[PDB]
Amino acid sequence: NGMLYPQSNDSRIVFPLDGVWDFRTAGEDSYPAEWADAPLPEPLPMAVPGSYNDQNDELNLRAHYGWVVYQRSFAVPSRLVAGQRMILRFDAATHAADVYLNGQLLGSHFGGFLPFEFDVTSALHAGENLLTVAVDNRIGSSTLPVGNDAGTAFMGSDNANVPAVAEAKKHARRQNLPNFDFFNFAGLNRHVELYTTPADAYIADIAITTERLDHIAGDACTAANALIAYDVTFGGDGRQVRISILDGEGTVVAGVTADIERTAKASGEIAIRDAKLWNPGAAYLYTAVAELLPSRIIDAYRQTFGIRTVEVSGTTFLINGKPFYFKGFGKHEDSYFHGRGTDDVLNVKDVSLIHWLHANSFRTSHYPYAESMYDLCDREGIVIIDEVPAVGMSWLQYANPLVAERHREAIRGMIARDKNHPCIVMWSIANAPGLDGDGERPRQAYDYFRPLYELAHASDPQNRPVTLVCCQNDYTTDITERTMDVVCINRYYGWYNLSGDLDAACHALNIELDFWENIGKPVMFTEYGADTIEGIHGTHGEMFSEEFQRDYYARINAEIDKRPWFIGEQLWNFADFATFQGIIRVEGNRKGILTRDRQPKMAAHWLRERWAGIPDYGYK
Amino acid sequence: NGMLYPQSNDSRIVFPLDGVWDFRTAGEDSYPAEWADAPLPEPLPMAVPGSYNDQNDELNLRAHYGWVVYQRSFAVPSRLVAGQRMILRFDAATHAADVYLNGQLLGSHFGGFLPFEFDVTSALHAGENLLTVAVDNRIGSSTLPVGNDAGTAFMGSDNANVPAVAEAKKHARRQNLPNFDFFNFAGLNRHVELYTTPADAYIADIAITTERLDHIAGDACTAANALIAYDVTFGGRQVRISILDGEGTVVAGVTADIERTAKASGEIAIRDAKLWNPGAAYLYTAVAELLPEGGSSRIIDAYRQTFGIRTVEVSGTTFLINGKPFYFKGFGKHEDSYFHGRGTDDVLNVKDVSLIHWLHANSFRTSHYPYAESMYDLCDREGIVIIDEVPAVGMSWLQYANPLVAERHREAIRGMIARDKNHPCIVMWSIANAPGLDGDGERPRQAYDYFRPLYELAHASDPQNRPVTLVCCQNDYTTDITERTMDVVCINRYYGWYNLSGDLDAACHALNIELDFWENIGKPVMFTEYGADTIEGIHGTHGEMFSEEFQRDYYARINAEIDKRPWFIGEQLWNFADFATFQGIIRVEGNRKGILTRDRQPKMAAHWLRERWAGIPDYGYK
Ligand SMILES: O=C(O)[C@H]1O[C@@H](Oc2cc3ccccc3oc2=O)[C@H](O)[C@@H](O)[C@@H]1O
Ligand SMILES: O=C(O)[C@H]1O[C@@H](Oc2cc3ccccc3oc2=O)[C@H](O)[C@@H](O)[C@@H]1O
């Protein structure tokens, strides 16, 4: 289950396959399999990584439904492949892919936001190799994220009772209809690379955990002793693995040799004296170096980690034993040109903006992000709530075992990929599913989600808190949200209801806060906000003005400040982002406190000033 | 002098070093050299490739003056470096760099827009290697592009006679003051990679030229015969040259003797050759294979060089591609985007080429510096013509007497042409943008004496011997004696914008007076800039300056005038898209003369131009 990011070292090399590929669109339900046997005819250029949808203005690829086919050639020296295990990794292909090498089907993947790989040792040959990747963008009632099989996209307008409308629907061009509020960007959204490991025996997975901290400093910068655990998995076939712990300056501060036992695994614990802890706003990273022993080294892998604990205790959220307060937002992987394509310039800039704002956290709304963003947040001291793509869900999905299977894959896959990041403090198993109502519906939702809550706990060796992000609903008939480790609520009082009336919005919010006060869980906002067009101004700000967005946060935040059990404020959204078109989306979702080009609206300045005065620890 | 882009094949591998590096700002005139000896203290993250300026909103890196230091570590298997020649290539470090590996100074480079490399065979070691790169952003009276040592940035406002202003200037924080109208984005703007070649003997350079075409078809798609030439240089006997067509079929091949300094050269006849044309690209591959003594079947080294078969000839007032009279449709561009700055972005390059097609344009100029190599490969495959330009922008008489500037200028011309010579999409070289050329006394002759040797140098350096131009600023064309001697006259004119403002009747009258002057000169003439700053969303029934309507009306009126001149062979407007500049009173969040917004969205004028260009053929318009 290990999916360690490809590394280059004395025992391993990575050969990136990013660049400008060849590309063709294909059919709604098929593509020509023979395209894997020869160069694509009349190809278009297509940069990888990137969504394909915004990379060709002659076409309207945002309207594309079904398959596209990518292809490129590559060659590597015979010297490099000799005796090695050769692996082809796709960091993400959104949503499903069939992969061919030299005309041989390697296999397929379903799930648009997690990495997958193939052993191509036997399919590779000398000279030029032809790599063909068919990618399917289709979403529907059995996918995560969820699409609608008929009707409209989420938040779409209709006149369904007009006979002409009903008839035209029957014959309209097939389109994906997201049951979620972000554009269905598709393609090779993240990197592609060929990499090598030793063949006879190799490191397959590494898990590092913080088991216990002894005598944590008052400022939490250090602990007198930290007990960490390692678990290393091997593939291949009295062997041993050397584990070296490097501090921030690369000094080997601890080292052990562990026996490998057969399924082939080595595990143990290491005590670190005067351990330097990882904290929001004050990152510190160690490296665990694993070396498979025969002076020689057979294989090696360098795994970054941070030493810190996470504990929900009553209505507090303790990081290294200190009461943490979330400041931040949901984000999206979204930008002009790239779409959902990973862009590390943008990631570096965004992390700097999180600091400029004096925020300390975000959520990976609504899918796991590119691996590089978590590495960045590890080094920059920004906390993450890591979320699977289970958005758009309701009772139709809970009754479908295929969806449950995909959901379990997404949870296991996210945690297997991301478990070693100190920046991740909580897992989210869904966003805005249907949880409330009458009859059997609330119990049916609980019966669907409770085993997934348990799965996220079982899968994470650090046993971090697990939540489910709840959409505005009848909280009195929802019986699932209140059972989560942290209550995470999306609320739009004064925007989607009581519209523009901030007094009424705050009154309604306080009524629901009184409800949560009794439940006795820690609670935080994971969404709240107001669409805002930069440059629209009013002396008495109305909806869509910069002033209304600022006033909205000023009023709502004054209310949650009065509740000691309310442990965080993550707003919606960090930045404006693309959506399916519709009458409430002014060139996408405009609830960003920043524009899509990362420029600050009035509310961003107001929030920066507020957040400057709120400490990471001890606010409540 | 060869700088072939790194390739992976059976004898060569490339190891990319892009990613998130460590980064620190340093001083105005220095940086700590000891930072090369250990990991940078308290580093910031910085993505490579990219400009650094817009990658950290906590800092104000747009205001930074002087040095920054990049650093990262890397490791590669010993088995792959063993016995190989190891080269570290920087596609671009803007503007100057000192490079260290494991604490050893490899060397330095000046020139922010062309690649450079170091042999690191001896400096590499097993395990982790520490690569430290100091990058200097400073510009001034001896750099290309040119900065101002004092005063204001180009087209900056001043009240120089106010004593308080004069005094405050003396004590103001040092800042780069561009003498050019684009922001001074700096850093590791393009890719970094380590690559290998065989050590004993290897291919160092390849030049492919189209020497002659016989009996070109009426539609220019083919010629009965094409004579091409190859010139292969080696470092560190025979080389096999194979010519592969679009399907990879070997249609021609010769084995050539290597003579010492070590080179092989010759000619190859291609019967029924498929030609490269604007709007109808066709590419061959020349595969060069170094053969062992002497001799066996095995290959010592190989390189695959893309090329296209086409001729370029200025004839009277026509610009002939494959003997057909071409008409340029397009624009100056910039490598410019949110977040990336001047950083190369192939998603953006792929998108921009699709927009060039959407507009029905056929060409652009690399204003005002050589672009990333990948964009030329893309234009080769997409049939888009390029005017390739060096960063000699902001120049005036202060520079012409400066030997360091002249050397840097010669370096840029030789470096650009050495890097870019094999692209069929490149049809013309530009040796400068908007230098001072006119005036009285000795000034016009001084400018001519500076630029004429550079014109000759561009001709001597290009084995294809393509036309050479100098892109001319709006000036007194009657006292300029340099522009009229270029192979194609390329003019930047802003009648109705920077002069006769808003009066399109007067602008067209003035343009026609200057066109009458060029009609007498008897050379082919094209626009390389003309336009109007335009804020998307500003509208008027009678469009005034900055409205979308005025921009549309501007092109409608000016283009109607040049359509009347048979010797006017192209229209490249300013600009493809809005881009960042130094701040000032005439730049509304940068330069807004884009027909597209900075996010590549079309203004009214873009739609009008799309319809116009749809009706103008690549060949035979005039
Ligand atoms: O609407 C948004 O901006 C975000 O909506 C979230 O889901 C919710 C939608 C509504 C709609 C009407 C009334 C209350 C709601 O409460 C919600 O939580 C969704 O999580 C985001 O992805 C959307 O972008
Ligand atoms: O001004 C621009 O938008 C571009 O100007 C070009 O150079 C010239 C500037 C001026 C200024 C005042 C009057 C006439 C001018 O004519 C010019 O040719 C320059 O090449 C571009 O880089 C600028 O962005």
The largest chain-to-chain contact, stated as pair and per-chain residue counts, equals: A-B, 57 and 57 residues
The CATH topology name of the largest domain in chain A reads TIM Barrel
- What CATH first level of the largest domain in chain A would be assigned? Alpha Beta
| CATH architecture verdict of the largest domain in chain A | Alpha-Beta Barrel
CATH superfamily descriptor of the largest domain in chain A: Glycosidases
Strand order of the largest sheet of chain A: 23-24-25-26-27-28-29-30
Domain Glycoside hydrolase family 2 immunoglobulin-like beta-sandwich (chain A): 238-308
Protein name (chain A): Beta-glucuronidase
Family (chain A): Belongs to the glycosyl hydrolase 2 family.
Domain Glycoside hydrolase family 2 catalytic (chain A): 310-614
Protein architecture, described:
This is part of a larger assembly, with 2 copies of chain A. In chain A, 20% of the residues lie in helices and 31% in strands. Chain A has 620 residues and is α/β, with parallel strands linked by helices. Chain A folds into 3 domains: 1-198, Jelly Rolls, CATH 2.60.120.260; 199-309, no CATH class; 310-620, Glycosidases (TIM Barrel). Chains A and B meet through strand 3, helix 1, helix 3 and helix 4 of A and strand 3, helix 1, helix 3 and helix 4 of B. The structure holds a molecule of 2 linked components (BDP-SE2) (2 copies). A molecule of 2 linked components (BDP-SE2) binds at residues 181, 366, 431-432, 471-472, 490, 492, 496, 527, 572, 589, 591 of chain A. Chain A: Beta-D-glucuronate binds at residues 181, 366, 431, 496, 527, 572, 589, 591. Chain A: Residues 17-198 form the Glycosyl hydrolases family 2 sugar binding domain. Chain A: Residues 238-308 form the Glycoside hydrolase family 2 immunoglobulin-like beta-sandwich domain. Chain A: GO terms for molecular function: beta-glucuronidase activity; carbohydrate binding.
